[PDB]
Design a protein around this ligand. Sequence first.
Ligand code: GTP
Ligand code: GDP
Ligand code: MG
Lengths: 297, 194, 113, 432, 436, 184
Amino acid sequence: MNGDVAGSLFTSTYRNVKLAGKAPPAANLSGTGSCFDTTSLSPARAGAHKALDVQKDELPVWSKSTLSYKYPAGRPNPTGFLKKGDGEMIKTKKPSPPQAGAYKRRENPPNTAFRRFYERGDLPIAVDHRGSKNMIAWKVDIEKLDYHHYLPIFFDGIRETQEPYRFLAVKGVEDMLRVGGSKILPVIPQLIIPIKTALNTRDHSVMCITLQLLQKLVLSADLVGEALVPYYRQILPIFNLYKNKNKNLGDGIDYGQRNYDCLGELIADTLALFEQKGGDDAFINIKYMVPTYESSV
Amino acid sequence: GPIYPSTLRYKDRLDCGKDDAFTYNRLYTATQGSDVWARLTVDASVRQSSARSRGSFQEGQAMVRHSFKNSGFDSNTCPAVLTHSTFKAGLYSYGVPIEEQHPITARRFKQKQPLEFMTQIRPHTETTNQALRMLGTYVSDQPHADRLGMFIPAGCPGGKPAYHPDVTTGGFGLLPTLPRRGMGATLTDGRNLK
Amino acid sequence: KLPQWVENDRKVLRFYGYFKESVVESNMENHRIRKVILYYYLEDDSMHVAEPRQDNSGIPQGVFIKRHRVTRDDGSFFNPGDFSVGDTVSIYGRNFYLVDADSFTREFMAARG
Amino acid sequence: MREIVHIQGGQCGNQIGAKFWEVVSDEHGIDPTGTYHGDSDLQLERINVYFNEATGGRYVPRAILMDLEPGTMDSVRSGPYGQIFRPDNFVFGQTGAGNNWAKGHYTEGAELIDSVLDVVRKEAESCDCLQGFQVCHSLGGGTGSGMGTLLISKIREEYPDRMMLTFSVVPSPKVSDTVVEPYNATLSVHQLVENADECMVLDNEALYDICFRTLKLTTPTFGDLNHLISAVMSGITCCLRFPGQLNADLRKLAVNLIPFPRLHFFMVGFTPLTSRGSQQYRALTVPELTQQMWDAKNMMCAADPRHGRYLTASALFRGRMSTKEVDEQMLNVQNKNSSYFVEWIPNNVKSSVCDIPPKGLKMSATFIGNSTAIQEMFKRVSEQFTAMFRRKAFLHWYTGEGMDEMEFTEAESNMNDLVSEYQQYQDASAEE
Amino acid sequence: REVISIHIGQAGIQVGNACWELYCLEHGIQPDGQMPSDKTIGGGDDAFNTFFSETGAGKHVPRCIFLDLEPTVVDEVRTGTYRQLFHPEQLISGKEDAANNFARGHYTIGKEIVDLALDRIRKLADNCTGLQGFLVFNAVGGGTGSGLGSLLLERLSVDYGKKSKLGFTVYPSPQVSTAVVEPYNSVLSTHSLLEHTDVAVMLDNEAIYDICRRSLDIERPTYTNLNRLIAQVISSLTASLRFDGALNVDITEFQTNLVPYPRIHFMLSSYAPIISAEKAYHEQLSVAEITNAAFEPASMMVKCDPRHGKYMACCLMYRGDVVPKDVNASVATIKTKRTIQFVDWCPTGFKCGINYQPPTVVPGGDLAKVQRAVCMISNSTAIGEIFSRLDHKFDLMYAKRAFVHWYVGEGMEEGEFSEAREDLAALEKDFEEVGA
Amino acid sequence: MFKNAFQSGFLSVLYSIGSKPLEIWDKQVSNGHIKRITDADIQSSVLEIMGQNVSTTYITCPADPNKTLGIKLPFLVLIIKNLNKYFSFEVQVLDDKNVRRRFRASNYQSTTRVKPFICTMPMRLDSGWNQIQFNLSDFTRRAYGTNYIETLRVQVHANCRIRRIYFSDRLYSEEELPAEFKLF
Ligand SMILES: Nc1nc2c(ncn2[C@@H]2O[C@H](COP(=O)(O)OP(=O)(O)OP(=O)(O)O)[C@@H](O)[C@H]2O)c(=O)[nH]1
Ligand SMILES: Nc1nc2c(ncn2[C@@H]2O[C@H](COP(=O)(O)OP(=O)(O)O)[C@@H](O)[C@H]2O)c(=O)[nH]1
Ligand SMILES: [Mg+2]
């Protein structure tokens, strides 16, 4: 429930990098080159989790003798032989799945269609650079632009973490969601892939921004809720992953409330907004995907 | 770095001497070592290093498989699962017969393990309830009991020798096949079939 | 001497036989007879049984057994000298009665004995 | 009372079902001509689950055979125990899928699925109380995947509350028959997750490894692998057909193995499996069965449990055994390997005992492993699928038959999010 | 599961009366047309049904037509050993030859023979019930094999469409050819054939010369020794349609698993083992070496070195004594090799095939009785070098407008020469871009 | 190249009036000739491309075969005079599924064939000078379900007189075209 999703971007980033003193994650800048020239498009995919763990020889061997798994005996080396007194030392003398990481951050190279269409320069986007949080100066009027061609472009740009790109993408999404009327319904089947790609990456800020954008997407329409129910199979898994992640203070007061960093309540609010909007036969799919959810009457 | 010039080829050291007589004059003077055995050890070391540089070669590139009659039809056949075997597990002899084995041995063998003892005493029984039924239900139990010193209370379960309808033991039994009481030689009586 | 599979590569034993099959209640008949042609390859000692596909019979006819080495119910495989005419052969729980033999088979057994 | 209807799809499903029927018929004592010749009355009370006594002591399997190449049904009819199948159950097309999932699901589906549905419906309504359908097929070819998945789905809306077993083999990298294996496999596993009650993951690579090392066989043709699969299915279904000290039917195993409806892929193992020469020198007690059962290399799929955690597990025991040995062995397995079982589910093992061992054996066991290591195989298939799909290789052989690249997109996306949920459920502590 | 074959040209007819002899020897059908009654070979009827049709009186007639324009090669088929085997209407001969002119046989002479050939093949297919798909034989360097050999294919495509058509063509050699105008015919035939046939297996006469001289040890290999190997290849690639096997493949498998893109259908045939009776039995033939013997460039039926190119997909047909385990073992080791390589986007490019019946030895032939054999059919990017050289030698002649007055003077114009040239250039670019 | 360029409403890749017009283009001439002469009807210097074989002599826009220029302009415009000879030109485009398509317009063919990689269409010319607009986006949207993103290369064949080949973003008319881009 934020009036402006982009109204806290720069403040939060600056606070994290300087005010809090926490080390800012500076990755996925490989191949970006400089400015004023196009980024070399890497063929890597952000959504895919190309972990592919390779335990070639540290896999413990099953022991039929004793049911406990045991590591293989060490290779005897010629450098270390049997010393004089080690015989008395011998008298005087646990496996696990390696990681199977699900909560680790997935890499997201800057190869979205938003970026390309931006350095090409066919987007009518400009920054007002006002005293308040920046708006978008639209060269062409928003109501008459083609949503079928531009909406998938901007939701694919949510995944950006680079400073000049993510703000523009989020603000454009905000502007068309606020302005668009009944023309969002026919294009909503095309918007599943970018939302899923933005959700698949395990970035905290990216998840928060895409959750807020989903809330305003379902909110700022007339009957879009009844069209998102068949597509719950590709959006709700991330909600299931991060539903219970929430900070607990025994008696302290949560100060970081004006910014929506903790996604634990954000997921609950998004699931609710899914429940009221298009509530006809909607609990069944959500409960099938998320088993821990409860009805909001 | 070989001490002896033996390792190098002919024209290799010839070209070396044409280019540099400098190395060409060490590889002869490298043998200045007083002890020949030490120089032989160094030669062994350099030969061993050269061998280590080379890679191993497997000798099983062409797999050879023996064929019974050298025909694909025969080789690819798997025998059909046709068995006239008895269905009861107890009929098979998985152990030495309990009769010859010593009485106290049978007693403590029962004491550690009742189950397979009951199965050996009751070869025809197939279900757990039948084997662990009673020492008095089967008439054949009494010889085993008084051979192994197991007391049998009187009138258990009944005096009249009977009461095992499922299992075919003693005089109460009939084969499920069509010529009951056995010995079927024609189609008229069934020929031991259904 | 040469390998068996090349000495007789196309030499094929071929016998004619039948086996009765008791059919059930029907105005047509009370029992039926199924003609079968039995093939035995001298190359790899592999059996083969097929039907001659009577014209108007409603039975699905054609090949009866895959052409493969059959195993008898008790043990060792079949032998060429176990296919006399007028004798009963037991294959896969069925009993075929050999009735007639091919001329090649006739002369081959005559040479064999 | 309870009835199991058997359906085979594709040629591989046909040989698998043929081997299953021969082994089951030998178990129940009926000869290749369809007449009972056994000696135990126990081979009669529960044969209605698989056979229908037609007339004059003739027993016919409750099986329906389905394929697209006449050679397959010619083979299954000609082979031993081939005349026991009723000819009306040989529902069959004419042209052939040709290893094309799109063809076998769209172009031949609409013409042949009517007759297979009619015959399976008639067979189901013939009996009294359906327990569930059992389907054997392959995930590599077209008719095995495309036709079988559509048939399974149609049976699903026709009979939603009935059980559904699925014995499906999956392609392997070291044993790769065709070229379009990932293309068919991804779509088949996409269709399987929503429709089938559960699927048991099989592959020829693990079977080959098992028969090479454990069986120590020299020339293990498809007959041996199909015999192993048939014995596995018989051990799975034994509790339905025979008395035991503790019973566990299909529904019992399904409810005890599936914690969430989307987790219905299991790895299976069988024991004992010993060499011919070493069979006489080893004894038959529960510990020997347990030791071979839990071996990671004994699994019949290419999903090593050492790479994941055991969510749930089953041990179906056949034979005259002691329950105390059973549960103490399983307790020892759980306690010693405490790091390979999921934390928030105590007592991850369900056990059952059956009193009828397989013919010629004193003791037998069957393992059903619901481990989260199948995501390895899923990712392995998905990476090949997306490697081929990125350059649109062989795509015209599917696009020109009615499909769109969209279908491939949601197929890979659902594979991805299924693997993601597996990753979620693998490492999740009891408290967060 | 029935297939009919059509033979076009003096080379096609000569290949036909070496494949049909092998087919007759395969099912025991004597040249008179009926099987002997005193003794039989093999077992299982309907095996011949995919090639022959029974008249109900113990007769078997092939499902083929020999098509040519000069009435001088069909006569020794009409008067040869197999006089009664072929039905008289099947053998079709014209009145005047096209005389090594693609344009002539395509437009002037071929228009009077295509109609009756289509009429005959229509009622040949009418007798059929489960027609798998046609398969052809012709030489693109020749005249009638190219002109009407393309017109008839076009009319078959417009008449049936979905029916598969296999093209077993003999392309001109890089350096050894018996004519001087063969580049023109080759280009003008490949341009039209590029979008009609579904399977196009390449062949080269002097490559077969080399393999016969080396493996078979024949110092003077004539055409009879050549077309006797193509017969074996065709039998091997259709052996799954006749006899049962552990792992069988039909034509649809070939189309699905060997054609990554619609215009990329050009396969490089190979065979193993090519051995003689002297060396057949001393060598212990096994799956591993025969599968290895099928991938070196020295045994490929076309001299197109696969080392330069990359294998997008490969196909294998095993016959004889082969189990599904050693084939996989050999495929694994071959994949581990580094001399050959596969394209990036295709991780697995093998379509294995296992059959049971060993190849049948022909009396008075070159090959010996071998208990197992491999017929490999690949698809590699190296084949771009063939068209790259044939196009260059075509341009060499076309720069002076040499011999064009014989084609244009017939009634065609110069535009289609250039469009065929640019189509071949586009094919070159297509083969180049897929290798990236 | 051309990725860092402004790429405005007009963008010229080759103009016959300059010191080194063929500065980025790579010459491939055999059995032909290339010249820079002045024609008799517009009194301006034009580039000469004539070859006995049309497929042999050509010039490609990027000199380096691996390297490709990127132009997002939908319309491509060529100014050529019809010599009543065989002439053709070929253009490569990039779609949103990241594959390379080719469009070849030939003067000596009749059929219009659509293929996954090459689309050949016939094209007709009048007697004298004429300009042609290609409209790459419309062709890509018609032949395939894709859309136009990038143009990778352009290549023109023999028997043509080329001058001021350029890209554009709109179907500019005679009146509103800038002075240097009209015909006369
Ligand atoms: N492999 C093989 N190729 C042959 C044989 N006979 C002819 N050829 C090829 O065929 C070419 C000659 O053309 P033809 O086969 O006669 O076809 P054509 O164009 O109709 O020529 P004509 O029959 O004279 O009208 C030669 O270049 C050979 O390469 C043969 O017996 N075996
Ligand atoms: N276990 C087993 N696997 C088989 C058998 N036959 C084929 N396969 C496997 O099935 C895969 C190919 O399936 P396919 O023939 O295309 O099935 P289809 O869809 O019916 O055509 C191969 O990878 C084989 O390993 C068999 O008899 N037993
Ligand atoms: Mg000729």
